[PDB]
Write a structure and sequence with these properties.
With about 130 residues, the protein is an all-alpha fold. Helices cover about 50% and strands about 0% of the residues. It has one domain: Histone Acetyltransferase, Chain A (Up-down Bundle), CATH 1.20.920. It binds the ligand CCc1c(C(=O)Nc2cc(S(=O)(=O)N(CC)CC)c(C)cc2O)[nH]c(C)c1C(C)=O.
């Protein structure tokens, strides 16, 4: 099969707000992970056609990646911070589901998740 379209990132029928937690998720959390030496495989959707991974989208039906999360934040897609945290968690579990343990991609995902969890523990106070 061809790749699926990427996840939706801007929905004009969704309400929009700025919150301290959402701003922190973009400016501190996403920004910090994005610049990590292991971020690159997670900066865009998996191109399963070009990577010749024909079963990727047979196994992974809720794909997610940081490029998508960044666009969601930039376009006010999320109302609650948990929606964003959930997308990060989906990205990491997809990696753990599809890949064999001990693969480099898994070790990279683990390092990113550790950094993510550290940053998530310092979320600012809710309004
Ligand atoms: C291992 C596949 C994968 C990636 C990934 O992105 N791998 C990848 C990307 C590129 S590439 O992005 O540079 N590239 C050239 C533009 C794509 C064709 C190259 C050159 C080699 C790679 O192994 N990410 C995730 C989450 C996964 C899995 C299955 O969990």
């Amino acid at each position: 099969s061809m790749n699926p379209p990427p996840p939706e990132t801007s929905n004009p029928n969704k309400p929009k707000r700025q919150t301290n937690q959402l701003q922190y998720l973009l400016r501190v959390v996403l920004k910090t992970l994005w610049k990590h030496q292991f971020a690159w495989p997670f900066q865009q959707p998996v191109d399963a056609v070009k990577l010749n991974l024909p079963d990727y989208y047979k196994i992974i039906k809720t794909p997610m990646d940081m490029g998508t999360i960044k666009k969601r934040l930039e376009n006010n897609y999320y109302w609650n911070a948990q929606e964003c945290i959930q997308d990060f968690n989906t990205m990491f579990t997809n990696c753990y589901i599809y890949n064999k343990p001990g693969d480099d991609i898994v070790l990279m995902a683990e390092a990113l998740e550790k950094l993510f969890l550290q940053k998530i523990n310092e979320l600012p106070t809710e309004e």
